[PDB]
Amino acid sequence: GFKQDIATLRGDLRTYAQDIFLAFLNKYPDEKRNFKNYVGKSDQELKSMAKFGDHTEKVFNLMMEVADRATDCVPLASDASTLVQMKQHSGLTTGNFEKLFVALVEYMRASGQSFDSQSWDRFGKNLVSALSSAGMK
Ligand code: HEM
Ligand SMILES: Oc1ccc(Cc2ccc(O)cc2)cc1
């Protein structure tokens, strides 16, 4: 289930972080509005850009922590507040997060693998709720 999936993702985190983010950017190309430096690049080109590798991994490092601290796919209020309050998220709305988790669930649903895609969909919904409750528009 969900806890095992966190262990699976962590076991190959660089590869999952990159592949899931690329799945997001390719499903929702207008999301590059927030990622102007990733425009006009193939997947292989992006995976050779230092900040793409570094930042993607740091994002999924924290995403796996927030998942791990959750109870029944419901994140901590402190983790939602950190996500709303981060200088780097000043732009964003809950729709940006909903799209990331739609892409993550579809990636899991297409993978060869026994991911608990249902639990990740709930986690994305519940994180969106926590973000809205903690002040994200
Ligand atoms: C649970 C989901 C997410 C987590 C854990 C998270 C975490 C992070 C972290 C740790 C950073 C700092 C990266 C660094 O500077 O090395 C970051 C930066 C950023 N995040 Fe998020 N993030 C999440 C979702 C999103 C979403 C959905 C978007 C936009 C659609 C987004 C946009 C950004 C941007 C634009 C930056 C800074 C610019 C950049 O690093 O390229 N984040 N995020
Ligand atoms: O180089 C970066 C890549 C992504 C982000 C935020 C983020 C958003 C969605 C995602 O699936 C992974 C990361 C920040 C910096």
TrEMBL record:
Residues that bind heme b 12:
H89
SUPFAM superfamilies linked: Globin-like
Q: Which residues bind heme b 7?
A: H55, K58, Q88, H89
Q: Which residues does the annotation say bind heme b 11?
A: Q88, H89, F97
Binding-site residues for heme b 1, renumbered to this chain:
H55, H89
Positions contributing to heme b 9 binding = H55, H89
- So where does heme b 10 get bound? K58, H89
Look up the signal peptide feature and give its range: none
Residue positions binding heme b 4: K36, H55, H89
Which amino acids does the record list as binding heme b 8? H55, H89
Write down a Pfam family by its short name: Globin
Superkingdom, according to UniProt?
Eukaryota
The residues that hold heme b 6 are K51, H55, H89
Positions of heme b 3 binding: H55, H89
Residues bound to heme b 5 are N37, H89
- Globin domain location, by residue? 1-136
Annotated binding of heme b 2, by residue: H89
**GO molecular function (one):** heme binding
Q: Which UniProt keywords apply?
A: Heme, Iron, Metal-binding, Oxidoreductase, Oxygen transport, Peroxidase, Transport
Per the similarity annotation, which family is this? Answer: Belongs to the globin family.
**Designated name of the protein:** Dehaloperoxidase B
**Source species, please?**
Amphitrite ornata
